[PDB]
Amino acid sequence: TGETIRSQNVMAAASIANIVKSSLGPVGLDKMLVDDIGDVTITNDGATILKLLEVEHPAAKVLCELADLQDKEVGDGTTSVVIIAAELLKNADELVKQKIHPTSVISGYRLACKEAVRYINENLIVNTDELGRDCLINAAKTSMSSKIIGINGDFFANMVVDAVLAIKYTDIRGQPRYPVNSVNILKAHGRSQMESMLISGYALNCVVGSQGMPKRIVNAKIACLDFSLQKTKRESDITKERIQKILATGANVILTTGGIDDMCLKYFVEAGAMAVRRVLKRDLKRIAKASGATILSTLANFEAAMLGQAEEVVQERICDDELILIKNTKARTSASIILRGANDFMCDEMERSLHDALCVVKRVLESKSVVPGGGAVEAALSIYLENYATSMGSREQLAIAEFARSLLVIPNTLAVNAAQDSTDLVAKLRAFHNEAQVNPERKNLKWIGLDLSNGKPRDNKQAGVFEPTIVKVKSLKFATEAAITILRIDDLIK
C-alpha cells in the first residue's frame, strides 16, 4: 500500500525522470504535452517539458525547482541533472534498504562528487587554442554530419572557422566572445550551392547606392539616416541642406535608409555617399556597431565624429548583381556568408545547417576550458570512483560505488535514444576507459565517447565532440544537491 516517504519520493522522481528520459540527446523523441483544457504541445527538450508539466508530487516539484535553478546557469543539461539525480535517488534507496543510514549515503555522494570534480579538472582539454584548428574544423565538420551540403560543406567548414575566430570580439574584459549576428545570412540566386564563400562584410542584393563613389572609399563617416529625401511645399524640403550640413560635420558616406533623393545623382560624386532603401535594421545596427555611426531620423542640432568608418564599398558584379559591399568597417561585425543556389528555399535547411554550425563552435570557443562530450566523462568517472570507493574503507564505501553506476545512465539513455544496444555501448566505453587506467602508456584512450548520431564507440577529441567543463561541473553539483535534498526528506510514514 505504501509505508515510506523515501520510496514515495524515489517513485515520484523516477516518474519525473522517465518523461525527460527519451528526450535527452539529439535524437530524442516527442513527449506530447496535452492537458485536459485542449492544448496540444510537441517538444523534444526537457526545459519546455518540465516547465509546463502539471507536476503532482511535492518532492517532484522540489526536483523540478532545482532543475530550474540549474536552468538559469548554462541553459541545457536539465534532463541530465534530472536523470542523474533520479538514479542517485534510486541507488540511495537500494542502499538504505540494506540497513544503511541516509546520512552515510548523503556524505558518500558528497565525497564522490568532490573527488569526481578533481578527477575532471585533472583530465580536461584546452586543445582548442589558436593552434587547435584542425580539431576545431573537424568539430565544425562533424557538427553537420550526413547533410546535403557535406561535400561542399567541407568548404563551409573552411569558411566557418575563420568566420568565428577572425571576427571575434575581445570584450570589455579582454575575452573572446563571438556574436552570431556578426556573420549574417545572405542568399545568392542563380548559381548552385557548390561554390558558397564567406565575404568580409555585408553585400545586399538591393538598390544600388550610387555611381559616383570609387571601389575603395577609405575614410567613411556613415550618416545612417531614416528619412526619405524629398522636397516639400535645417531643411524643410529635405533634399540638400541638412545633407550638406552633416557632410560639413564630416559625413563621407551618408546612408539614407528611406526613399531616394531627386538630386543625389549630383551629390553622390562630390561626397561619395549611398542610398539604399529598407536596410535591414538588424544589419543596419550591425554595420552601425561595426563602424560607430549615429542613426538620425531628423537632423536638427554626434554628427562630428560618431559617423562610422568603412574602408571599402565595391561596385561590381557578385551574385550576378551590382553588390553593395558594406565591408572592412571599424569594429568586427563585418562578415556575411553568401548562400548560393536558387533562393533561401532550396538551401533553406542547408542555411539552418550553417547557422547551428556557427552556434556549436561559438559554444566551444567561449569557455575555452573544455571536456569531451559523448558520455566519455561519465564512464571514466565511474571507472575512477569504483577504485576510489575501495580506496576509502569507511561506511560510505558503498555510496561512492552507487555513485558509479548512477553516472553511466547518460550514455545508457544516449544508447537507448539512438536506436542502438543499451548496455553494450556502455560496456564498451567502460572497457575503453579501463586501459586509460591500467595501461599506463594508453592515457590517450580517454575521450572515447558515444556517437551522438549513430551510437558507436568513437573518438571525441579528434571528432571535435566538446562541452564546456563548467557546464558538466555545475550539472554534477546540482544533481548531487537535488539527490541530497530529496534523500533528506526521509523520516515520514507517508
Residue 224, classed as helix, strand or coil, is strand
Q: How far is the CB of 33 from another protein (least distance, A)?
A: 28
Give the residue before each break in the chain, using a C-to-N cut-off of over 2.5 angstroms; say none if it is continuous. 233, 301
* Catalytic residue, candidates 134, 320, 348, 356: 356
The answer to whether 39 is a known catalytic residue is: no
Residue whose CB is less far from another protein, 95 or 204: 95
Residue whose CB is less far from another protein, 96 or 255: 96
Residue 433 CA to residue 419 CA, distance in Å, equals 23
Residue 28 CA to residue 414 CA, distance in Å, equals 9
210 closest CA partner among 131, 276, 259: 276
Residue 301: CB atoms within 10 Å: 12
- Chain centroid to Cα 326, Å, comes to 27
Residues comprising the chain, all counted: 494
Residue 19 CA to residue 166 CA, distance in Å, equals 42
Q: How far is the CB of 377 from another protein (least distance, A)?
A: 17
Residue whose CB is less far from another protein, 44 or 434: 434
Residue 147 counted as an annotated binding residue: yes
Cβ(10)–Cβ(93) below 8 Å: yes
Residues that bind another protein (CB under 8 A): 98-100, 383, 386, 390-395, 397-398, 422-424, 427-428, 430-431, 434, 438
Residue 455 counted as an annotated binding residue: no
Residue 324, classed as helix, strand or coil, is strand
Q: How far is the CB of 431 from another protein (least distance, A)?
A: 4
Residue 78 counted as an annotated binding residue: yes
Q: What one-character DSSP code corresponds to residue 467?
A: E
Q: How far is the CB of 492 from another protein (least distance, A)?
A: 22
Q: How far is the CB of 77 from another protein (least distance, A)?
A: 26
The answer to whether 298 is a known catalytic residue is: no
Residue 170 counted as an annotated binding residue: no
Q: DSSP string spanning 270-288?
A: HT--EE-TT--HHHHHHHH
Q: DSSP string spanning 33-95?
A: ---TTS------SHHHHHHT-----HHHHHHHHHHHHHHHHHSS-HHHHHHHHHHHHHHHHHH
Q: DSSP string spanning 232-255?
A: ----SSTTSHHHHHHHHTT-SSEE
* Catalytic residue, candidates 78, 142, 333, 480: 78
* Catalytic residue, candidates 4, 43, 45, 48: 45
463 closest CA partner among 374, 377, 379: 374
The answer to whether 257 is a known catalytic residue is: no
Residue whose CB is less far from another protein, 393 or 440: 393
Residue 76 counted as an annotated binding residue: yes
Cα dihedral angle (190, 196, 201, 203), rounded to 10 degrees? 0
Cβ(319)–Cβ(199) below 8 Å: no
Q: How far is the CB of 408 from another protein (least distance, A)?
A: 11
Residue whose CB is less far from another protein, 339 or 398: 398
Residue 364 CA to residue 362 CA, distance in Å, equals 5
Residue whose CB is less far from another protein, 364 or 399: 399
Residue whose CB is less far from another protein, 244 or 422: 422
All three cell numbers of 68, joined, read 530550474
Residue 146 counted as an annotated binding residue: yes
Cβ(464)–Cβ(136) below 8 Å: yes
Q: How far is the CB of 424 from another protein (least distance, A)?
A: 7
Cα dihedral angle (448, 451, 457, 459), rounded to 10 degrees? -40
Residue whose CB is less far from another protein, 183 or 408: 408
The answer to whether 45 is a known catalytic residue is: yes
Residue 80 counted as an annotated binding residue: yes
Cβ(207)–Cβ(360) below 8 Å: no
477 closest CA partner among 103, 20, 109, 19: 109
Q: How far is the CB of 133 from another protein (least distance, A)?
A: 34
Q: Which residue numbers belong to the known binding site?
A: 25, 76-80, 146-147, 374, 467
Q: Which residue numbers belong to the known binding site for ADP?
A: 25, 77-80, 146-147, 374, 467
Q: Which residue numbers belong to the known binding site for ATP?
A: 25, 77-79
Q: Would you name the residues annotated as active-site residues? A: 45, 78-79, 356
Q: Which residue numbers belong to the known binding site for Mg(2+)?
A: 76
